[PDB]
Structure 1
Amino acid sequence: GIREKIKLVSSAGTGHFYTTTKNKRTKPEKLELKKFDPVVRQHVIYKEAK
């Protein structure tokens, strides 16, 4: 048994992602996270695994 790491995609319109461990057996519903990005040098939301 493992919680597994999933990739949330940046609102920068690219394939760039942030990985987090998110167990489908405790919280399967979608998540969106605000983080800093050093390429746009400002904060963006990372959302959804597909």
Structure 2
Amino acid sequence: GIREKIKLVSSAGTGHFYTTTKNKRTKPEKLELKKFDPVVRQHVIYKEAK
């Protein structure tokens, strides 16, 4: 319902992104997580986008 779809984009420039959801109303701060980037095969910071 309220909880809207976003993508978390790699910070390695590979164009890889994960996709998730976020409640924008509560906790509006941008999401940031160490996720595995398979293009570079390293754990890298992924930042909220879209």
Is TM more than 0.5 here? yes
Structure number with higher strand proportion: 2
| Equivalent-residue separation in structure 1 for 2:41 and 2:24 (angstroms) | 32
Q: 1:40 to 1:15 in 2, by over 3 A?
A: closer
Q: Which runs of 5+ in 2 are unaligned?
A: none
Q: 1:29 to 1:9 in 2, by over 3 A?
A: same
Contact 2:8 2:49 in 1 (8 A): yes
RMSD: 1.6
Q: 1:37 to 1:14 in 2, by over 3 A?
A: closer
Aligned twin of 1:20:
20
| Equivalent-residue separation in structure 2 for 1:20 and 1:12 (angstroms) | 19
Runs of 4+, deviation exceeding 4 Å: none
- TM-score relative to the length of structure 2: 0.75
- TM-score relative to the length of structure 1: 0.75
Q: Which runs of 5+ in 1 are unaligned?
A: none
Identical aligned pairs, as a percentage? 100
